[PDB]
Amino acid sequence: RSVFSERTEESSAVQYFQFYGYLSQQQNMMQDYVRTGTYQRAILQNHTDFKDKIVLDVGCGSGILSFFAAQAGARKIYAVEASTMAQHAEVLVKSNNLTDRIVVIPGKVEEVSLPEQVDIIISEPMGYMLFNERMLESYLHAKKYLKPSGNMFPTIGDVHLAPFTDEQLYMEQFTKANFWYQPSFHGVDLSALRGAAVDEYFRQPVVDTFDIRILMAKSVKYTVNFLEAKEGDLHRIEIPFKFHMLHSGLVHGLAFWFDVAFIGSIMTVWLSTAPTEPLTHWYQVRCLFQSPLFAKAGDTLSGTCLLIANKRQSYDISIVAQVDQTGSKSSNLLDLKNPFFRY
């Protein structure tokens, strides 16, 4: 009936919001000091954007971002959270004597009712690779409560992608899949399923960090402006790329990371998950080609990353890439909801 339930299978939403009901998972995000500290830095150093303002916090979890908005002088903060963590958030509002300023609204932001329009929306809608969880659509949907010329923290999101070489990772995943190459596993021929095995394993985005030396070209940037984008813009995301190869060797896939910017009135604060920056709980995301492409320094690698949103709150991704000089092409599919946490 709501925007959320129409784009989400019930089974996916059940486990999604169950996961976020656990205090241990809040502790996991909260202890990410880069994540929490940078958010507090963006809000407090842009205190003029909050002093005596009305605020909406989409997916407040424990409410930590609402407390930051309160520290900065917000008049009232509506803190929307759909999981059972909303109960714990209210417990914290009372124990911190902020009932006069933080109002927890249990429910999905697409279904709750607010008493007034807000001057600024705050949230942490970024999943790994930015787009996982499809919470950005909820973040954009909440703009219906935003006054004209109201701001959004974060204001923009940059996705970066670059080709990488990592023969060890390629062999690690290929070795796993080659279990189904065995013609006599306890006397049983499994080889018929090797193709299916390779497909499954290489659909798994590899979530971990890596040394920046594996990148073979300067990254391409894809920007989402949250002030301007409509949630319908995230249903089918097409990212073209044209890499100018800086080193020769095997391109085993593409690495992904993202930055968000809090464009406030005092200053712009950046939160980056790049491999050149300290590690965050988002790590970085790499997509493996089933067969790597050989490229020489100076060659151009062009193609397209197509992200199709699914009803399991994630994306099905297709990456097509070709070495222009030789016509060597690679076509791949990722299931962003089935990641391999390798770290």
């Binding site: 486990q15 999604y16 996961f19 996991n28 999943g127 790994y128 979530v207």
Partner: peptide
Amino acid sequence: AAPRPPFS
């Protein structure tokens, strides 16, 4: 599943 990866 696991939306947010474990950290530290």
